[PDB]
Design a protein around this ligand. Structure first.
Ligand SMILES: O=c1[nH]c(NC2CC2)nc(N[C@@H]2C[C@H](CO)[C@@H](O)[C@H]2O)c1-c1nc2ccccc2s1
Length: 290
């Protein structure tokens, strides 16, 4: 129930300086890649924008149409806002409201010298991302790729879920022959082909451990290589959550950290049916602050 502006490919190509692959530091427009396309910076109709140039040529178009369909239905403060698209020119384009603070992944890794996020900001981001996932679930949508690189941050560090190309509708448990997502964030059933909102909750649990630790979901040069495994180290009493807390924080209290960890631990239950639903995750995150 939302109609979008149709942008000219050449208006987008013009404003993004002919889709420059160079970073913003040197003089280019490229903001990043991974979402089956490349994101560029632009200025259109008196507003700063993000332009996603998509990007089988038919499978990429499916990822383009589904994103428009999901964004036409799903409008929430904790979701990215689509302004319009482009189909006329060579490549397919998606135009969104610009997210000045980029991704949660980049802000947890302090990429390009940006200051570390305070525990106060992290609690707000976790609550915001949970409100975004709740909105999608209440509206019978499964994201299928909940990860820190897909949680974007605005002018006020408000969390905004992005990338709905792989999203699926509900309004059970479906199965698929095309297993999509990011392995390090994926639930056991999702890696096996199942399609359930319960898998989105698991992925969110990995995101909460990233928020607490400031560690990426997967690191080749690390023990354990997968962040989700720390849950076992803490459960076996070999280590504690306090040993994993991001040292790049001066405002993190033990009570709220443990309260967030408890939510992440519950989210990361290997049995899909034992996991809390998004409404419970939302409640618990609110109770943590309050
Ligand atoms: O509006 C944006 N601003 C910034 N950067 C500001 C200068 C800081 N980066 C974005 N994406 C990149 C995605 C990537 C992780 O893979 C990171 O490297 C991010 O930088 C977007 C959007 N990306 C998307 C993607 C889908 C929907 C909406 C948007 S808006």
């Amino acid at each position: 129930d939302t109609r979008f502006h149709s942008f000219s490919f050449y208006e987008l190509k013009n404003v993004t300086n002919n889709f420059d692959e160079r970073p913003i530091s040197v003089g280019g427009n490229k903001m990043g890649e991974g979402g089956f396309g490349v994101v560029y910076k632009g200025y259109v109709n008196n507003t700063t924008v993000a332009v996603k140039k998509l990007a089988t040529t038919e499978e990429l178009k499916q990822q383009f149409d589904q994103e428009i369909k999901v964004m036409a239905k799903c409008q929430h403060e904790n979701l990215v806002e689509l302004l319009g698209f482009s189909s006329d020119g060579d490549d397919l384009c998606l135009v969104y409201v610009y997210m000045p603070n980029g991704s949660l992944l980049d802000r947890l890794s302090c990429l390009d010298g940006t200051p570390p996020l305070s525990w106060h900001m992290r609690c707000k981001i976790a609550q915001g991302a949970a409100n975004g996932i709740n909105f999608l679930h209440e509206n019978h949508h499964i994201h299928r790729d909940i990860k820190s690189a897909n949680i974007l941050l605005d002018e006020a560090f408000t969390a905004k879920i992005s990338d709905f190309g792989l999203a699926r509708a509900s309004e059970q448990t479906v199965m698929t022959s095309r297993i999509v997502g990011t392995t390090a964030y994926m639930a056991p059933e999702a890696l096996r082909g199942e399609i359930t909102p319960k898998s989105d909750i698991y992925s969110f649990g990995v995101v909460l451990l990233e928020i607490i630790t400031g560690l990426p979901a997967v690191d080749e040069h690390r023990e354990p290589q997968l962040l989700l495994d720390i849950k076992e180290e803490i459960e076996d009493e070999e280590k504690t959550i306090e040993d994993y807390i991001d040292k790049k924080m001066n405002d993190a209290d033990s009570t709220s950290v443990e309260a967030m960890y408890s939510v992440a631990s519950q989210c990361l239950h290997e049995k899909k049916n034992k996991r809390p639903d998004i409404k419970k995750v939302q409640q618990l995150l609110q109770e943590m602050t309050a």
